[PDB]
Design a protein around this ligand. Structure first.
Ligand SMILES: Nc1ncnc2c1ncn2[C@@H]1O[C@H](COP(=O)(O)OP(=O)(O)OP(=O)(O)O)[C@@H](O)[C@H]1O
Lengths: 134, 240, 233, 146, 238, 250, 240, 228, 139
């Protein structure tokens, strides 16, 4: 199957108008064929969310959620380091999914930092083998 | 290619490689720190930072800038448990130099002696190689300031500007262009570059309280640690 | 005493070969090229030291570490294991100079050092050195050139080489270097053969040239190093 | 996902799993019909399993407490005829590295020798007997300990 | 299964199996129940033998005048530590001309067994010592384990199926502090009598009892010396 | 720490010595040395391992070591490995001459070294010595003696020798050329050159690849003759003349 | 496979599992935290109840090593007692060769060096004890150090150990380390300890407390519970 | 799973000691008897071939003047303990001007029971039967390689010791006279041996407070042979 | 292993199933099985109890009398010269099996084919013997 991809992108053909995007866990298996330009011209690795970007992604998940008038996001940014942008949202949702036990409609961020700190740190215990090659 | 106990002990691979020291090389990444060493004409600047996960952290106890000699400071990387063990032996060897030879140590020979002991850790397979990274400075008579580094390969090293560790690979290539050209180095020049190499890698631009900036200059040769108040002055000086 | 295990880690292969020592020979081949030439008046050694980044300064670390005023030396392989036996031989020549009050012979250094080194291969619980020494010096008017190995054997060559492509370089030194020539020629063909496997950049800091005159060893400064080779070879 | 290619025999199942996770990625409707997963050991775990639609709630399940080991076996033997003399504390303290299912094995062991006993009703001492029976292992002999 | 080889290796769960395997040796020893009151202390042990002709092996042995001890498990390391135990007695008895309070005494024992629980090539010590003694504040009862943890108690028990004895303890040990020596003795052996099978004695020679007091020096009681203690007791029911 | 040792000291359940078997296999390779029975003298020769003409050859006798004025040795194996043993036995000989002021006889000499080597075999897991080296010399009592060292700790002393495994054909040659009381050391020298002229793989018998060290008995100097290749070449051509004369029969 | 056996042996991930297993070994112990006020240092220990088990006041984890320093330990009790002897003997060396109170810093450093040293050889094992170190003095002040089985020497105003850790130090931000005197810190800590550590896992338990500072005149001792009886008074009424 | 040879078993106990008890099964059997008049002890020499010299192997040697002993399993293994114990009791006689008791030999050997290890090597698997006459009269003691001592009236070792204790307690009683015990030993011996009874197959070790030493002498056994 | 197959432990499991096949449960049929190898120490003792528990033989090295017999049996069909003696031949040889003394005779007859002679002389026999003698002694 490679040979079809490889020969059609080493053509003998104009792919200029068409566009292609490739994704993987690691660029270990891609061979010198796909790591070569042509087929794969550019490479953009994802990086861990910066704390400045972490504040942003936090902001977009606080919108639909209902909170108390007293809110401080920086507490979460400082307490949450190295997490994945998905894992941040899972933590926000877990903060809300912890409020249903308290049955309260409006939820303060104190209860949030409770669920955040505890559960997120549990994610760190399950974070083994997260280191991935370049 | 691996055969026998060579993964568990210190020997030569079928290709001649050593597995333990290459593991200790990446042992620094578990510390998650960064250290940059820049030397000027009359000066040398050392910049680092620290992590403050809890508001209960004391800035004084967790400071990563260690002072071996009144005129010679140092810094470390990776885990601190291993660095501390090397601290007291650095100091001990400084004092024995001062006792035996009656004069201050060039610091050139300090990293060499230390690196010999590091060879012993590399040789014996029944003891831990101690993969902490040693970074030093020094002052020599009419030789200007000096910057040394030591890695747990059992060897000594020292250059103009050298930065080794987790993210230091990218800071290096950034420094190589700033050094030359023809660019000369003064005091405020080096101080102002210390943050540029950190920003290009990080670009966090945060409170100066987390970062520690060491310097060694020949005015009063005594090593001095910079206060946050003056550090912030340089930080607002570089941003116009 | 460590606990004092001291069990030899090198078994004898079914063919009689040594395991760890041949692997250490692989570390010698993976090291850096270093040539030497014994001709006429004295011995000339040529090492190579290249920096991995432009931030490096070679005025600090020296590859040529003379053990005596009239006895120099270079190496190939890993450096850490080199420094060890350096300080060793320094303490080792001093008993000779203390008992006899006479400069120790180059051939004596080899025997003493390689005996301790061979014992270092037989000593239990520790790996041999991965460094092949090239020893020189002038004694009794006739200078000398020796070459050591991790197993501890010692040879005598007019012109030899270690490091990568040392078998290719050796055929070059055989044909291109012969009989006996002055120290100037000794420098010349040394730098030519070193420029064989060297990169397309040759500076005073890329290599160093050590020389043993019958007047004694003198380590040349990078100034003269770039003066002879500029205009390399 | 092993490490080095090629290849993994499960690799088609890793692609299928990563296609499942991809289903929870590129497609929103997978937010319906919950799916539960369970592993005997987390030694090998795909890092990609961390998400709200992927694995989220995570609990490490240790050995049951003594209080638990007492009650679970009582809920297991509640159908069986038992003499109304038990300590309950005894067995609970006497259980280390034991499992709740081992407790079921102990309740059956109690009835296994009850056949040769002839007693139509289970007794207290039968329990501890069965405990020491299957655990821990066997056998050798009681000597050298005076 | 290969990580249980050494004493130095930490299990993936952090539990070193060498100590646990020694605890099994403690459980294979005879059931012995020690107890103390606010005034006098009574220790009880059980004698066992392999053949009928063989004399039952004694457990409780006298060290200090006010310090008796029981034993279970390996007798090798037991008598080794017993030589150490004698040493520490006569030590302060010579230098300070006074005995040692057991509190500070067993700390020395735990530090003694700390080294062989850590250094490679060394093994732990299987131990069933239950130590009793009188300082100025009265009696003390401790316990010994290969883990080198000593716990101050009023009563403790080790050996085969010795937990069932504890079950009799909890309710009785609170009310046995006021009683005098007499009933305290038989209350000691009442815990063992439920450890052994109920269809047989429990003779005079298969059992060891000792009594120690503030004003009463410790004397080893065995055989006919147990006859005054066993007499006047009620047999176990069916 | 017990799992790291390969147990080089303990035996092999087959009855053989595991380390020692591989040890002897090293002597089978590398070094090659010969020995023969000669009257009023003794002869030794070896094949140089580095036949490359770029060497300096400043070491004089290389594969032939002289441990004493009355005795010498022919080494086969790793050079430095021997070089521990040469200075060792050299000190033992010199402390005999120190204590008794008498030349050490070959017997107890050799056996002393052999027990030293045996020590490394029965304890310590140490690397035994895989160097089997020869022995020559003269004593007042027994006169000329020939001995041989073995890794196993037994001395392999005979009147002839096989070093290394390439010389096992020289032993079969020596059983056909066996002689008792005939020297003419030059006859035994043309014999030993006849050995390498056939059994050795290298042909033409290059005089620079071998070294012949003879020791003739002299009172009381015990002259040690180290010969140059110039007079060996004419001797080799005399041997080849003997070969050319032997083919003249048929 | 076998990489986790010897602590001196590295792992393909560039660390040592023996330290790692030793860490959670201390986590399974009962919760023992620490906190320091301005004029002193507060210690606390929670003692579990399994069966009875024995007499109250036995094998408490609160040990007194020095005049002004004490040991609040967690994890395996034996190793803690042995290390308490080690700190005792070290403090004795200081008092012998100098004759004044050993500063907290170099004390915990001397211990930390041993903690790290028993992890550089295959003979001995990493320690399974983590303990709190704190002291107060008039020419010193209030310092609290936290020592971990890896051998890292640092310290905060408060720290938490045992099965309840993150949840144990969560409410610490609510408490004022500075304004609140030590007299009040006692009850402030005890009430949360009574509320934390849920009784479903352990039905019964017992709580120990210790303090040193200016009120005791530098003398470190376990605060007498018959005195003031602070905990149960406010802790039994703090459940609502 | 060979662990430091000193390491506990999972069950458990000392590996090498547990294994060393099995070496008693392969050794010769010996049956001692304690009598009020004295202590009699017998063994089977187990003669393999007529090449064997009768007086070359003796399973019973007297450690102290009034205290004997009997070994088990391997011979040279006990040699080391034998000759050293006699020195122990001797020095006791020097310091206290009085001989060592039968019970004292027990702790004497128990202190040296297990000295094996590596730092700071194999435990002996020879069991010991201590005979002798202390201040309380004729006594017979038994000890094991693990170091556990126990006082036995009539104890057997070796291979058939399990079967020998069997027929032992059947015929054993406390009113045993010494002359009766003597001929009671040989009854079991002749059942457990393959060779015919002769003066070279077995030996009798007897000791009494009023008859000593004794030890034993030749031709005395020859009269016991015809007593069957 | 040959070609691409794995692995060391799967190899063992096919051998173990060979034992249960051979043990065995439940077959009384024969198919008598004989096993042979050079080194018995490699095979696991797990294989011996099912078979062969009754009989295993060891092959000793031949002595002077045996080697004399061996030469007799091979040279029975061959024609040799009168001067060939059987004493010196077996004396010069040390630890040789039947096929070795066989191969030296085969090469003696092969060399005798160069002269086209059916009777092998002792000089030709010894010169041929030296070829295999040099063969084993060359490397
Ligand atoms: N006593 C004897 N009499 C006659 N012939 C014998 C005697 N001993 C051995 N032989 C012959 O010598 C031969 C020895 O065979 P050899 O051991 O050389 O085979 P091989 O090539 O090693 O076989 P494989 O390679 O399968 O092990 C046998 O074929 C046998 O016929």
């Amino acid at each position: 199957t490679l040979m079809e991809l490889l020969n059609q992108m080493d053509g003998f053909d104009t792919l200029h108008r068409v566009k292609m995007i490739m994704a993987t866990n690691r660029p270990d298996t891609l061979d010198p064929a796909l790591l070569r330009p042509g087929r794969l011209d550019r490479k953009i690795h994802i990086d861990l969310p910066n704390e400045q970007a972490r504040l942003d992604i936090l902001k977009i998940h606080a919108g639909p959620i209902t909170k108390h008038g007293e809110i401080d996001y920086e507490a979460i940014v400082k307490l949450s380091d190295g997490f994945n942008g998905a894992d941040l949202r899972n933590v926000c949702t877990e903060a809300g999914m912890f409020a249903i036990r308290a049955d309260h409609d409006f939820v303060v961020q104190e209860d949030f930092m409770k669920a955040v700190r505890k559960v997120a740190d549990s994610k760190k215990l399950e974070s083994k083998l997260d280191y991935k090659p370049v | 290619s691996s055969a026998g106990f060579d993964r568990h002990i210190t020997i030569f691979s079928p290709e001649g490689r050593l597995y333990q020291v290459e593991y200790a090389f990446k042992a620094i990444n578990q510390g998650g720190l960064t250290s940059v060493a820049v030397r000027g004409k009359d000066c040398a600047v050392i910049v680092t930072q620290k992590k403050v996960p809890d508001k209960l952290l004391d800035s004084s106890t967790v400071t990563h800038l260690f002072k071996i000699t009144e005129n010679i400071g140092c810094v470390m990387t990776g885990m601190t448990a291993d660095s501390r063990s090397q601290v007291q032996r650095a100091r001990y060897e400084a004092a024995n130099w001062k006792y035996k030879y009656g004069y201050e140590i060039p610091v050139d020979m300090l990293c060499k002696r230390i690196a010999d002991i590091s060879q012993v850790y590399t040789q014996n397979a029944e003891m831990r190689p101690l993969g902490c990274c040693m970074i030093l400075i020094g002052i020599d008579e009419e030789q200007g300031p000096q910057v040394y580094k030591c890695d747990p390969a059992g060897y000594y090293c020292g250059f103009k500007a050298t930065a080794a560790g987790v993210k230091q690979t990218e800071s290096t290539s950034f420094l190589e262009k700033k050094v030359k050209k023809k660019f000369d180095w003064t005091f405020e020049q080096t101080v102002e570059t210390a943050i540029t190499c950190l920003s290009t890698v990080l670009s966090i631009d945060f409170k100066p309280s987390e970062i520690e900036v060491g310097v060694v200059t020949v005015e009063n040769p005594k090593f001095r640690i910079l206060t946050e108040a003056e550090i912030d002055a340089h930080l607002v000086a570089l941003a116009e | 005493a460590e606990r004092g295990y001291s069990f030899s880690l090198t078994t004898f292969s079914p063919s009689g070969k040594l395991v760890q020592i041949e692997y250490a020979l692989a570390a010698v081949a993976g090291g850096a090229p270093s040539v030497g030439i014994k001709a006429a008046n004295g011995v000339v050694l040529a090492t190579e030291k290249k920096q991995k980044s432009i931030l490096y300064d070679e005025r600090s670390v020296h590859k040529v570490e003379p053990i005596t005023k009239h006895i120099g030396l270079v190496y190939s392989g890993m450096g850490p294991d080199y420094r060890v036996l350096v300080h060793r031989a320094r303490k080792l020549a001093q008993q000779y100079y203390l008992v006899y009050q006479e400069p120790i012979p180059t051939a004596q250094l080899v025997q003493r050092v390689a005996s301790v080194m061979q014992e270092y291969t037989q000593s239990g619980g520790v790996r041999p050195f991965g460094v092949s020494l090239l020893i020189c010096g002038w004694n009794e008017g006739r200078p000398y050139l020796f070459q050591s190995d991790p197993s501890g054997a010692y040879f005598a060559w007019k012109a030899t080489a270690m490091g990568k492509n040392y078998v290719n370089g050796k055929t070059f030194l055989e044909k291109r270097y012969n009989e006996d020539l002055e120290l100037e020629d000794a420098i010349h063909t040394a730098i030519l053969t070193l420029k064989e496997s060297f990169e397309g950049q040759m500076t005073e800091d890329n290599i160093e040239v050590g020389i043993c005159n019958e007047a004694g060893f003198r380590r040349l400064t990078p100034t003269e190093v770039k003066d002879y080779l500029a205009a390399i070879a | 996902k092993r490490f080095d290619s090629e290849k993994a025999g499960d690799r088609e199942v890793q692609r299928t799993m990563l296609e499942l996770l991809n289903q929870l990625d590129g497609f929103q409707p997978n937010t319906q019909v919950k799916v539960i997963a369970a592993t005997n050991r987390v030694d090998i775990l795909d890092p990609a399993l961390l998400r709200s639609g992927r694995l989220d709630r995570k609990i490490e399940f240790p050995m049951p407490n003594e209080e638990a080991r007492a009650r679970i076996m009582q809920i297991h033997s509640r159908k069986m005829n038992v003499s109304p003399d038990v300590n309950y504390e005894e067995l609970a303290r006497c259980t280390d590295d034991f499992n709740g299912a081992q407790c079921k094995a102990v309740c059956v062991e109690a009835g296994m020798i009850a056949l040769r006993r002839g007693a139509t009703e289970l007794t207290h001492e039968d329990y501890m007997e069965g405990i020491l029976e299957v655990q821990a292992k066997k056998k050798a002999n009681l000597q050298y300990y005076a | 299964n290969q990580y249980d080889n050494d004493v130095t290796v930490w299990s993936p769960q952090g539990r070193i199996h060498q100590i646990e395997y020694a605890m099994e040796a403690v459980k294979q020893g005879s059931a012995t129940v020690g107890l103390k009151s606010k005034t006098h202390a009574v220790l009880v042990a059980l004698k066992r033998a392999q053949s009928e002709l063989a004399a039952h092996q004694k457990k409780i042995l006298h060290v200090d005048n006010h310090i008796g001890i029981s034993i279970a498990g390996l007798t090798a390391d037991a008598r080794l530590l017993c030589n150490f135990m004698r040493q520490e007695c006569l030590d302060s008895r010579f230098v300070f001309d006074r005995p040692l309070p057991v509190s500070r005494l067993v700390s020395l024992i735990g530090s003694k067994t700390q080294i062989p629980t850590q250094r490679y090539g060394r093994r732990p010590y299987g131990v069933g010592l239950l130590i009793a003694g009188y300082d100025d504040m009265g009696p003390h009862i401790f316990q010994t384990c290969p883990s080198a943890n000593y716990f101050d108690c009023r009563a403790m028990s080790i050996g085969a199926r010795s937990q069932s004895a504890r079950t009799y303890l909890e309710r009785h040990m609170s009310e046995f502090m006021e009683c005098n020596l007499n009933e305290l003795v038989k209350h000691g052996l009442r815990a063992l009598r439920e450890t052994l099978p109920a269809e047989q004695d429990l003779t005079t020679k298969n059992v060891s009892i000792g009594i120690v007091g503030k004003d009463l020096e410790f004397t080893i009681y065995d055989d006919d010396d147990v006859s005054p203690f066993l007499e006047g007791l009620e047999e176990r029911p069916q | 720490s017990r799992r790291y040792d390969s147990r080089t000291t303990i035996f092999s359940p087959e009855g053989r010595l595991y380390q020692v078997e591989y040890a002897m296999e090293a002597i089978g390779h590398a070094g090659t040395c010969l020995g023969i029975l000669a009257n009023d003298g003794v002869l030794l020769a070896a094949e140089r391992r580095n036949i490359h003409k770029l060497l300096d050859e400043v070491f004089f006798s290389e594969k032939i070591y002289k441990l004493n004025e009355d005795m010498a040795c022919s080494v086969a194996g790793i050079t430095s490995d021997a070089n521990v043993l040469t200075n060792e036995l050299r000190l033992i000989a010199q402390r005999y001459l120190l204590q008794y002021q008498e030349p050490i006889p070959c017997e107890q000499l050799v056996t002393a070294l052999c027990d030293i080597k045996q020590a490394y075999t029965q304890f310590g897991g140490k690397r035994p010595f895989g160097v089997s080296l020869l022995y020559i010399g003269w004593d007042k009592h027994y006169g000329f003696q020939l001995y041989q060292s073995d890794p196993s700790g037994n001395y392999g002393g005979w009147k002839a020798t096989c070093i290394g495994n390439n010389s096992a054909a020289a032993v079969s040659m020596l059983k056909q050329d066996y002689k008792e009381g005939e020297m003419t050391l030059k006859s035994a020298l043309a014999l030993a050159i006849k050995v390498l002229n056939k059994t050795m793989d290298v042909s033409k018998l290059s005089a620079e690849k071998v070294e012949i060290a003879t020791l003739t008995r002299e009172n009381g100097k015990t002259v040690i003759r180290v010969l140059k290749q110039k007079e060996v070449e004419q001797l080799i051509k005399k041997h080849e003349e003997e070969e050319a004369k032997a083919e003249r029969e048929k | 496979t076998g990489y986790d056996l010897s602590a001196s042996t590295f792992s393909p991930d560039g660390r040592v599992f023996q330290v790692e297993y030793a860490m959670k070994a201390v986590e399974n112990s009962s919760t023992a935290i620490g906190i320091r006020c301005k004029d002193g240092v507060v210690f606390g220990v929670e003692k579990l109840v399994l069966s009875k088990l024995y007499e109250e006041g036995s094998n408490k984890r609160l040990f007194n090593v020095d005049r002004h320093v004490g040991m609040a330990v967690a994890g395996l009790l034996a190793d803690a007692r042995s290390l308490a002897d080690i700190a005792r003997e070290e403090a004795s060396n200081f008092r012998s060769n100098f004759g004044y109170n050993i500063p907290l810093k170099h004390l915990a450093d001397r211990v930390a060096m041993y903690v790290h040293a028993y992890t550089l050889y295959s003979a001995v094992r990493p320690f399974g004890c983590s303990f709190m170190l704190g002291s107060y003095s008039v020419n010193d002040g209030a310092q609290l150090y936290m020592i971990d089985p890896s051998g890292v020497s640092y310290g905060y105003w408060g720290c938490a150990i045992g099965k309840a850790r993150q949840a144990a130090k969560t409410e610490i931000e609510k408490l004022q380390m500075k304004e609140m005197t030590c007299r009040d810190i006692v009850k402030e800590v005890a009430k949360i300890i009574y509320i934390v550590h849920d009784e479903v896992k352990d039905k019964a338990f017992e709580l120990e407390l210790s303090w040193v500072g200016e009120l005791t005149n530098g003398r470190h001792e376990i605060v007498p519970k018959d005195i003031r009886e602070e905990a149960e008074k406010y802790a039994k009424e703090s459940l609502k | 799973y060979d662990r430091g040879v000193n390491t506990f078993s999972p069950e458990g106990r000392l590996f090498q000691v547990e294994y060393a008890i099995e070496a008693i099964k392969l050794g010769s059997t010996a049956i001692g008897i304690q009598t009020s008049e004295g202590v009699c002890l017998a063994v089977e020499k187990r003669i393999t071939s007529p090449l064997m010299e009768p007086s070359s192997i003796e399973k019973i040697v007297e450690i102290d003047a009034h205290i004997g002993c009997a070994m088990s399993g391997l011979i040279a293994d006990a040699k080391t303990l034998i000759d050293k114990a006699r020195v122990e009791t001797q020095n006791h006689w020097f310091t206290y001007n009085e001989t060592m008791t039968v019970e004292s030999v027990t702790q004497a050997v128990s202190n040296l029971a297990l000295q094996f290890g590596e730092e700071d090597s194999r435990p002996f698997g020879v069991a010991l039967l201590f005979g002798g006459v202390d201040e309380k009269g004729p006594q017979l003691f038994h000890m094991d390689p693990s170091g556990t001592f126990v006082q036995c009236d009539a104890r057997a070792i070796g291979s058939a010791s399990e079967g020998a204790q069997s027929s032992l307690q059947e015929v054993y009683h406390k009113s045993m006279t010494l002359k009766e015990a003597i001929k009671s030993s040989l009854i079991i011996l002749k059942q457990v041996m393959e060779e015919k009874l002769n003066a070279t197959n077995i030996e009798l070790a007897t000791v009494q407070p009023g008859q000593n030493f004794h030890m034993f002498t030749k031709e005395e056994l020859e009269e016991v042979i015809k007593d069957i | 292993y040959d070609s691409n197959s794995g692995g060391e432990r799967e190899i063992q499991r096919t051998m173990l199933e060979l034992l249960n096949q051979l043990d065995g449960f439940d077959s009384r049929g024969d198919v008598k099985v004989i096993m042979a190898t050079n080194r018995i120490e490699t095979l696991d003792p797990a294989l011996i109890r099912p078979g062969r528990i009754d009989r295993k033989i060891e092959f000793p090295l031949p002595d002077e009398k045996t080697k004399k017999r061996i030469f007799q049996i091979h040279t029975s069909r061959m024609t040799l010269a009168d001067d060939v003696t059987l004493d010196d031949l077996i004396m010069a040889k040390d630890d040789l099996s039947g096929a070795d003394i066989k191969a030296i005779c085969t090469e003696a007859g092969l060399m005798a084919l160069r002269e086209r002679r059916m009777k092998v002389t002792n000089e030709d026999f010894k010169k041929s013997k030296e070829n295999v003698l040099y063969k084993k002694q060359e490397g």
